[PDB]
Amino acid sequence: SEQESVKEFLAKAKEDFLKKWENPAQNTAHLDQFERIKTLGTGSFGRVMLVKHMETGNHYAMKILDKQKVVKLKQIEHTLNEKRILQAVNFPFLVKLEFSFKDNSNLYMVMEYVPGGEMFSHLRRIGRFSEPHARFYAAQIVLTFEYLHSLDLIYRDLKPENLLIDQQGYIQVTDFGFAKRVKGRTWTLCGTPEYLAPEIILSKGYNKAVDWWALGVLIYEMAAGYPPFFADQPIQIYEKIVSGKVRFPSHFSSDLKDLLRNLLQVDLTKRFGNLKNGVNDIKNHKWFATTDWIAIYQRKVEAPFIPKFKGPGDTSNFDDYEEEEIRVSINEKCGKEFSEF
């Protein structure tokens, strides 16, 4: 009967998504309404900055993408997907999208500012996570992937660098730049080398299952302190993944080893998450035996770590990047290309 309670939730959930998916939100703000403070990260065609909405006083994090740059690398459909999906979704562990707009040069997504830093930064600092601590994060990624997949969405870029810690010590998934709504197979060669399912590497066409594979790679980086497949150039990392030969740290509990052994399965018809029981095979595993899946959805569990921050607009849990002025050119660039944004 708890299984039926989720079924209902994700049915009402998918009704919401479709109303926003079919009729998406446009030009709900402007560049001049935001005072730009500091850069929080970057990417191939832009950056994310801390900002202040001058009329509400509130802080947000604003992604800024160069329209011309996106076209040069042929990445239009991806950038359009990010916004469409982000504006559509709604979940305790997904960064919100508050505003979006475009001007002559760039695309702009203003998201709720998550001041805790990226998991990545913390994990590198501390070294590695206690399994209980890594169970707390993993379980929020399970629920979120149970959510996304039921809207027929594949995430494709899970890794510590895109998992943000909020003030209550939980996760906001960011970077939906390779998210794609697909029923059936897709064949795009994208992701981060250390998180790619072998099927992707092998140009096979693939599905939701790659997200279960990444969840295992992620948990293993959380608990070991380093990924299961690594080296000094991608091509050497690719060979390790298809080889299908993992090796576990000696501290890893035996339940962790059996979980990972089942998510890091090369054979797609054996991987947890692509089987007849679905996601429940994961939820019902012994490593997750102490996990109250509903306390976690409801955010009533005690986070094993809360990041320190001394007032709003504090950027102290984030690295320092070189700054750059924002040139908005006098002529519209790529208007037709991004006309749905």
Binding site: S44, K74, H78, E161, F178, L189, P193, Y226, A231, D232
Partner: peptide, 20 residues
């Protein structure tokens, strides 16, 4: 150790995506 090899590796820094 394997922790040690990782720490010395080119890939302990934030990792970019690849794409088409």
């Amino acid at each position: 150790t394997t922790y040690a090899d990782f720490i010395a590796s080119g890939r302990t820094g934030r990792r970019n995506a690849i794409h088409d």
